[PDB]
UniProtKB/Swiss-Prot annotation, chain A:
Domain of life: Viruses
Sites carrying sugar chains: 28
Protein's job: Attaches the virion to the cell membrane by interacting with host receptor, initiating the infection. The major receptor is host ACE2. When S2/S2' has been cleaved, binding to the receptor triggers direct fusion at the cell membrane. When S2/S2' has not been cleaved, binding to the receptor results in internalization of the virus by endocytosis using host TFRC and GRM2 and leading to fusion of the virion membrane with the host endosomal membrane. Alternatively, may use NRP1/NRP2 and integrin as entry receptors.
Impact after mutating residue 44 to Y: In strain: Gamma/P.1
Name of the protein described by the UniProt record: Spike protein S1
Whole-protein residues included: 95 to 142 of 1273
Assembly mode: Binds to host ACE2. RBD also interacts with the N-linked glycan on 'Asn-90' of ACE2. Cleavage of S generates a polybasic C-terminal sequence on S1 that binds to host Neuropilin-1 (NRP1) and Neuropilin-2 (NRP2) receptors. Interacts with host integrin alpha-5/beta-1 (ITGA5:ITGB1) and with ACE2 in complex with integrin alpha-5/beta-1 (ITGA5:ITGB1). May interact via cytoplasmic c-terminus with M protein. May interact (via N-terminus) with host bilirubin and biliverdin, thereby preventing antibody binding to the SARS-CoV-2 spike NTD via an allosteric mechanism.
Native source species: Severe acute respiratory syndrome coronavirus 2 (2019-nCoV)
Curated annotation (Swiss-Prot), chain C:
Gene: S
Binding partners and assembly: Binds to host ACE2. RBD also interacts with the N-linked glycan on 'Asn-90' of ACE2. Cleavage of S generates a polybasic C-terminal sequence on S1 that binds to host Neuropilin-1 (NRP1) and Neuropilin-2 (NRP2) receptors. Interacts with host integrin alpha-5/beta-1 (ITGA5:ITGB1) and with ACE2 in complex with integrin alpha-5/beta-1 (ITGA5:ITGB1). May interact via cytoplasmic c-terminus with M protein. May interact (via N-terminus) with host bilirubin and biliverdin, thereby preventing antibody binding to the SARS-CoV-2 spike NTD via an allosteric mechanism.
Glycosylation sites (chain numbering): 37
Record-given protein name: Spike protein S1
Full-protein positions shown: 194 to 239 of 1273
Superkingdom of origin organism: Viruses
Described purpose of this protein according to its UniProt entry: Attaches the virion to the cell membrane by interacting with host receptor, initiating the infection. The major receptor is host ACE2. When S2/S2' has been cleaved, binding to the receptor triggers direct fusion at the cell membrane. When S2/S2' has not been cleaved, binding to the receptor results in internalization of the virus by endocytosis using host TFRC and GRM2 and leading to fusion of the virion membrane with the host endosomal membrane. Alternatively, may use NRP1/NRP2 and integrin as entry receptors.
Lineage: Viruses, Riboviria, Orthornavirae, Pisuviricota, Pisoniviricetes
């Protein structure tokens, strides 16, 4: 239940670290980017 | 379909090739159509 | 979101409006051959 598009995307994986696989789905107002790579996260994931 | 053929003249070197690797140890059996590329040592004991 | 046999499936729907009492369906929109192990999400 949303207005003004606050919710953006999702992350899927096993441990969400630079070691094992990770899926990112991002929706940065232009296109639906789906990216499965070996990806690193921080403890406060946010977008401007 | 499964296709198999011979590549002796394309993957054999007199000095020996070591570019091709396999895995021998894992904790649990593999799910169908699954790929794992971990490198963690097989924990056979208690001390890491 | 579903993940079976190495395939990742995503169904979606949008509508205008606690959750409301009503009936609606969802249409398939994404299928991908990801084929990995997924346990936790964010």
């Amino acid at each position: 239940i949303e207005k003004s598009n606050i919710i953006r995307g999702w992350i899927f994986g096993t441990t969400l670290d630079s070691k094992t696989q990770s899926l990112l789905i991002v929706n940065n107002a232009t296109n639906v980017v789906i990216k499965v790579c070996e990806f690193q996260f921080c403890n406060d994931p946010f977008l401007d | 379909c499964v296709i198999a053929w011979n590549s002796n003249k394309l993957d054999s070197k007199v000095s020996g090739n070591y570019n091709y690797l396999y895995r021998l140890f894992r904790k649990s059996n593999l799910k169908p159509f699954e790929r794992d590329i971990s490198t963690e040592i097989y924990q056979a004991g208690n001390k890491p | 979101f579903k993940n079976i046999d190495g395939y990742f499936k995503i169904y979606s729907k949008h509508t205008p409006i606690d959750l409301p009492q009503g009936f609606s369906a969802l249409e398939p929109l994404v299928d991908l051959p990801i084929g990995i192990n997924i346990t936790r999400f964010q």
